[PDB]
Amino acid sequence: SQLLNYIDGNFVTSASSFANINPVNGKLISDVFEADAKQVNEAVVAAQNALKGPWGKLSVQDRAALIHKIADGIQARFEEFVAAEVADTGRPVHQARTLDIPRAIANFRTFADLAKTSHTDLFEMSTSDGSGALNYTVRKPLGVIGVISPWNLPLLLFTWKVAPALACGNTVVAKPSEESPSSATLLAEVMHDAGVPPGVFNLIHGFGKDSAGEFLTQHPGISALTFTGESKTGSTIMKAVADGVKEVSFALGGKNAAVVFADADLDAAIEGVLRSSFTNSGQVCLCSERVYVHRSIFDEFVSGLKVEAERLVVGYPDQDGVNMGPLISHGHRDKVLSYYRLAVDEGATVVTGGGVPKFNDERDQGAYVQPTIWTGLSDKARCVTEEIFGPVCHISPFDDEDEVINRVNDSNYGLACAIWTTNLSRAHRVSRQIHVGLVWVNTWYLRDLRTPFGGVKLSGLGREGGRFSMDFYSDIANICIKI
Amino acid sequence: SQLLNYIDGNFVTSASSFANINPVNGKLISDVFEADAKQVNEAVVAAQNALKGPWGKLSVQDRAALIHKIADGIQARFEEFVAAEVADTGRPVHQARTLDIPRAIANFRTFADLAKTSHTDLFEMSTSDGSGALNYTVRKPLGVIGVISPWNLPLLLFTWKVAPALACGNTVVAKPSEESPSSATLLAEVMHDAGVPPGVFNLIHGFGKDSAGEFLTQHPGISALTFTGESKTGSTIMKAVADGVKEVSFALGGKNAAVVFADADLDAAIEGVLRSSFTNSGQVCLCSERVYVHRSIFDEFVSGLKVEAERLVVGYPDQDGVNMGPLISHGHRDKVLSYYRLAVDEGATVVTGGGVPKFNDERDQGAYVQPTIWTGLSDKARCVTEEIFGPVCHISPFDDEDEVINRVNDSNYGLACAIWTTNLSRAHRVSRQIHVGLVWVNTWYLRDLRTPFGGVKLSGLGREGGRFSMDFYSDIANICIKI
Amino acid sequence: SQLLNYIDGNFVTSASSFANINPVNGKLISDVFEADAKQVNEAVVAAQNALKGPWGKLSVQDRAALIHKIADGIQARFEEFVAAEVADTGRPVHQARTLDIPRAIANFRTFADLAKTSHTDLFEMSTSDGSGALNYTVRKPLGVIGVISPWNLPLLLFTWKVAPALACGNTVVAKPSEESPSSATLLAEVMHDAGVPPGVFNLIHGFGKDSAGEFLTQHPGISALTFTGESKTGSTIMKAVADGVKEVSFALGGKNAAVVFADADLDAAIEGVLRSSFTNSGQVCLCSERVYVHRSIFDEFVSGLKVEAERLVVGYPDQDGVNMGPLISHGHRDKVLSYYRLAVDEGATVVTGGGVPKFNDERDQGAYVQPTIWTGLSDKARCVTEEIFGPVCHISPFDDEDEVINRVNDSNYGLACAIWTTNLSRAHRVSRQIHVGLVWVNTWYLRDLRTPFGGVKLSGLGREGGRFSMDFYSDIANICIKI
Amino acid sequence: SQLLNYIDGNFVTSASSFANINPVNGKLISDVFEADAKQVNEAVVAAQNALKGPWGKLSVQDRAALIHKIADGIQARFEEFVAAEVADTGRPVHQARTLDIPRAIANFRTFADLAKTSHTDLFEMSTSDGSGALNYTVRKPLGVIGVISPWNLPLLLFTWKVAPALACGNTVVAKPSEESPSSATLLAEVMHDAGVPPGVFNLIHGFGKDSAGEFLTQHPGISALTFTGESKTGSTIMKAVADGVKEVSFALGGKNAAVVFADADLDAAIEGVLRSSFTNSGQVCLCSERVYVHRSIFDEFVSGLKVEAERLVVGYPDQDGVNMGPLISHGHRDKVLSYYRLAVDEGATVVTGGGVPKFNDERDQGAYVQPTIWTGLSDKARCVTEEIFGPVCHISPFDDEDEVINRVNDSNYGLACAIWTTNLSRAHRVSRQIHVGLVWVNTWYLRDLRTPFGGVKLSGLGREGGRFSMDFYSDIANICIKI
Ligand SMILES: NC(=O)c1ccc[n+]([C@@H]2O[C@H](COP(=O)([O-])OP(=O)(O)OC[C@H]3O[C@@H](n4cnc5c(N)ncnc54)[C@H](O)[C@@H]3O)[C@@H](O)[C@H]2O)c1
Ligand SMILES: NC(=O)c1ccc[n+]([C@@H]2O[C@H](COP(=O)([O-])OP(=O)(O)OC[C@H]3O[C@@H](n4cnc5c(N)ncnc54)[C@H](O)[C@@H]3O)[C@@H](O)[C@H]2O)c1
Ligand code: NA
Ligand code: NA
Ligand code: NA
Ligand code: NA
């Protein structure tokens, strides 16, 4: 497999290539061409010029129709996209088929629709002379949108940025994670085949520092940088665009808590925390890595979770009852195992897992680890405060509602929280006091694309979703007419 | 010993003080106590703690009432605030009485009212199990808001940030410009007398770099930094808060154009541009420093403007027919004069002004300059492209509509633009093509506080006003209930 | 006392007066002049004219300021207003003090504030010639608003229509209930002293059919009729305005259910149903005249309610621990007692009440009845289906959730419903299935003036509240500009 | 050809039929089965029942997809729908191809989209106990929607109601005009083939009084009646549904003015008024039957319009350059010619037209009239005040802006107005002062489906379009949770 850049309507190679590796078995999947600074410049310039071409002349309705055409194109090649996400990342085929690909299609359709229905504001005012004035606002394309995405839900998170950028009439230069370049490259093929004018969508491959990613962030030709990834990367990028005062939108790390109250439906909470800790092998930004369970049900909760975690099937993405694939890469597994060791050093009881499974086949050359549960750590332990991004959670008892609220909030992160309780008052009273951008009550990772999405503190800045994306990806202009 | 900080409900001095100078005569007005890093920390911590006191417990209705009381407090001491603004800035008394103070009061009233009327969103969704789920959003206080403000419209711009900050339930640490500290200090006394709880509003005085401004910018305890000032400073601030990923809102420099078409009302356009160029002695972010006039009316427009400029009275804030006061400081005057010289060097024709008036009295010790009109520079001249922020404008002829639109847009700034034309189609067709956040047609500086306000490119990041402020100064949380 | 009409800025008498009876003791409170057709027309013509006077020239900010002055004016004669409502209706003094009057003031203040903050819409569209078009909307005064109101919460319900009517720049012709004309007459005094331009607010006294009410409804000079009263009266008025195609807003009768599930907090539910049943002696449209209680807790619930019910103090508005006053009138008691009998004939067990109290003083000349609880009736019984509007409820057991939902919904009415449960899923699942405009969970008659308020089926049409009022009381116009 | 009813998923005949006539030549097109009261009852009951079946269980997204399939089905049989509208009404083929059928399709697509993107409101409130409460609103299906539509733009106006009705989850019983039943019947075929569940959409054929229309209007099983037609018919229907207090939405007659100011683009205005007067042979509710032209250009405008009118091709729907077809029916022509006579009797000068064209072929048995222009009548003449709904306009001079605004507003109707001017201030100043629901400047009949559409005074009640439809075709319910 060879993955090229896509710049100004053409697929192009580069003077440097890097390997895409399958985490299931450590084998080479494809060669990826790393865009250099010159090619990043070429992509931004094409994007700037495309804003002045046919793309810029399309009516909102025609633009939306084209975007639905893009979505049709992905649907027409549904299984090729499934194969690509799975190859790159080792995610179970079931997850790619039911969540990943359909959601990436839903991203384009939802924002295309929003573009058609969205409107702006009219403000009347009085004036001295008594003839009055009108102020009206309009949404216009912001310009060239730089998109930089992570490896954990490659096409879903890529299209979550690209869909609204295009729906708002911008042009795009997007850099997917070096770990997961395939589905973004296939999407470039879909764009090309759907007749998207050259320069409107540009795909550049590579790394961050001193590579495609950094060059993009440094280019004076962009109008905004939207980013999803680690918090420290977010800070680095915010500094990079500071001189250009570029618009910025960041969804970043988390150290998410799940709270199980005594009045929770216990089997449901056990199933839910099992899903929220170990889905995608713990590699979702929304995963719960800290868990608080009322003292009265703590022991029973921990026993039940141990049992369920130990029935999880870890293996091939298309294996019968598979629950978990491997981690994204050997490098990431090194980091995760290092955290496994640190937890024992910090005094943790290992309730289950804590190592890597032994398959006695090619999977042993992959990047697998065991779902892991810890107990007995203090709230200030590193393993309870730092984002690990693997299939793990620490469980701690609590006694009081105000107590557990303070403990959930005692964090430099603030992305998401999940609360389990059958009590009406408690659900609402407690949810509003959690210092995060997203709370789920009695469920996890249900997403309505209309809702505002983002985090607080180190977990981000700004919101995307529904009208928040329509506002971020547009110039909002106010036009005032004296009458 | 004149102007103190107000930290945790107490006026306090500092280790060192600095002089506040009257730009009308160069005389000492007051000594100002410069907060140190230690006092900056004390202020941020007090603001953090106030979030958890009685302020955090007020209903939105009671909070709004308390804010109207602050407004009533300013009103009760109207002339004292007038005297303070006039002293610091040399502002004509009439304009402080009619524009500055009433508008500072309106800031508090408008956002109090908005806080009471604002609501959020309810999203219903279907789920696999057929029972559904509810997503709803809430606005909560973001936390501690760091406010850094400029000297040009001291109280107006200070309250423009402080009003929505408080209306949204935040606490505040605000640093007014070293050049204009008085009206903000009086506002501290008004907050005190109205019984605003300690820690909710904190005033710190000082400079930027290596002083109170920088320190506020670097404190990990704030949740957001909203700033009005030079673009250079915006960039500097964006880098400072990057490690904390703090929310940012920037309204920065401009090099605003006025455009006068042949079908304009010529007398109204001359009067309009006179105001947009020379109001507040050209020291408003929204002033026009570039003017494009259709060739058919150019000579007449220039001759008319020269006549009206030379009828402007430059003098004392209480001088009978006074139109213009001094620049803010000798330092700013030096910069403006350096541009006056550059302009000549660049080949400009000085239509009028170009120097400093000779008063033969104490005003000669102040910081006055002449309202100035240039002609003959190219679009690439420094004086045509760099923000001067003095009472000046260059006037250039134009021939075509697409031409002038391009010349207006050919700037690294994009704050505002004024268009003069009587033609229905042209007004709306041209206005939408100008790459700014704010367009006025047949007027200038008409402000409705409900409208989105901000700029593009180097002129800013984000929007404030109406719901945009209610959103910026709030944590937006989504809460999803599985049924 | 003497109650005059207020027409074109003048208090005026008429050719006929009628008696205002105090129902505490049957004494004559005042004579009320009955507007005749000539006076009604005179009122409508003045309101029409007033639209082109100073009122119509007021900015929205000035209009809201005056409206707040109306509110200030009520606050300044607060006790006079309490006295008035109490005199007319027998309402407990505490209740008029803390609820009735403050809320009438809140009506003006809230709609004044909404008027200032409300805005409209801008829609951009592409056109064949590639130049496009703009559609914008504006709210304008609808014109002359006819207001006809009931006797149960005189000032509150009066001002609920008058406030938004005036806040939207309309003029008003208002016909208060013949039973409760006092507080409205006082308000006319407040309007006058506040300086409300003559013709802007007109008060007309009289009855419905063949009287002022009817004449108002038949007048071609009004633009809308907003009504609160009996559903049959609503249908009558609907036919009256049909030839003129007038805009209509109806809040009509109900036969509201309270539902108590087994997982309710029983003590709070007992207290809640006590209030929803007997507040204002059961003379609120929102009262629960039907109650369904889970079988498992039915007997305990009835016993608790009986006890709490028998603790209710029925006497003087000023009497010490007073809980109930009399019904509004002897005529109304005749109807209520007639139902008391009907319930017996129908098979009801009288758990408590069912007659009239005995005072051996002037009150025996009043219009008092006993708080009553029935049991043992069929869902098809008249007493359980028809609105009584007295301090009465029937309690029936239920077993299944879908069963009780069906029984609540089995009604030609559909105003409000109260649900008692501590279960999260249940609260939300059941509430959405109740076919009414207003559901309360674990409380009753909590009112936020921003929310949409109204009923379904016979209980009304349209919604008022928040933007629904801003919409109903304005002309919405769409202006389309071809560019 | 035979047109059956569609009831509960079955095409059904009836006891009696009536003839559908081609107005082009007076020939029989089809026999149409007239629904009787018994069949109307079956339809309504099927519709109530369908709300409780599969239709009522669809997610909003699945409902929207099914509605896009309905639209697809119309698209797939596009030319059959064209032929049907033309046969019924004599509409030029070009207009049916470019305007009539594409809009019918757009109606379904737009409201399907609005249904996916629409959301409701969250209101937080404080309470005495300090724990607070939530109010959230939801949109539910109103229930069974009765739709009665007119003959002028049959499928367009029919689907304008049926689309939002279904998009909002209602079931429908629809009665198209007796003059134009074909496309509605084809629409029922598309519904059937698309798999729309039985009872969801029901088509009943017949007349109004003493027929299907009247019976639908009287059935207590409907929840709303939405109507487009004559004002007097609207009044009749309003009385009919009054005992049931049914929600109603009316779009009724007009007597629309066009105004041509001295600064208009004269040739553009002549062409505009030509179109607004004679499109669909003057048979659009939005047509201009009154025209006011500035005195300075009156004679030239009138001479210009005469020439352009006499250039119109009146003939067969597929005739080479055809501009106008016949009126809908001989009955309607009888009324139109009656007004032609009356105009003469009232003292009108006939500038052109005023009779019937003579074809000397089968068209002479049709219902054609000549496009007609009058001059010289008083503002009080009946021909200038009463809706004719033919291809006619009267033209009168004016001098002053306020003068003409008053003359336009001096009507019992208030649907629309077209204004012609090149002046920015005038466009906006004059448009806001016209008492109508819709103004166009320098164009006519430009429709954005997101905009509020409707009239004032006799021209209607309520608004439809965008969120106004989403609100009208839904139950708005407020749910209040005590926390
Ligand atoms: N919605 C959310 O908040 C959300 C969602 C998913 C993942 N995340 C976070 O993403 C992280 C995991 O993804 P990741 O490991 O790929 O993050 P990674 O930050 O370290 O980098 C992600 C992307 O940024 C690029 N990049 C790295 N350094 C750069 C630089 N100096 N300049 C420009 N670009 C640079 C990378 O090439 C890659 O495309 C986790 O921390 C996770 O929590 C957040
Ligand atoms: N939010 C609500 O829906 C709400 C609230 C409170 C009370 N109500 C209803 O109010 C009713 C009690 O008040 P009511 O007894 O005064 O109703 P009442 O209908 O018989 O009359 C109310 C008003 O209508 C006038 N009126 C009567 N006949 C008229 C006619 N033919 N034409 C014009 N006007 C006429 C009356 O004079 C009075 O001003 C109850 O049915 C109750 O349900 C509704
Ligand atoms: Na890979
Ligand atoms: Na100073
Ligand atoms: Na009375
Ligand atoms: Na026909």
Residue numbers in the entry:
A (entry chain A), B (entry chain B), C (entry chain C), D (entry chain D): 18 to 500
Article passage:
One enzyme in particular, 2-aminomuconate-6-semialdehyde dehydrogenase (AMSDH), is responsible for oxidizing the unstable metabolic intermediate 2-aminomuconate-6-semialdehyde (2-AMS) to 2-aminomuconate (2-AM). On the basis of sequence alignment, AMSDH is a member of the hydroxymuconic-semialdehyde dehydrogenase (HMSDH) family under the aldehyde dehydrogenase (ALDH) superfamily. The complete AMSDH model includes four polypeptides per asymmetric unit describing one homotetramer. Each monomer of AMSDH contains three domains: a subunit interaction domain, a catalytic domain and an NAD+ binding domain.
To probe the function of Glu268, we constructed an alanine mutant and found that it exhibited no detectable activity in steady-state kinetic assays. We determined the crystal structure of E268A co-crystallized with NAD+ and refined it to 2.00 Å resolution. The overall structure aligns very well with the wild-type binary complex structure with an r.m.s.d. of 0.139 Å. The active site of E268A also resembles the native AMSDH structure. Interestingly, E268A exhibits completely different pre-steady state activity than the wild-type enzyme.
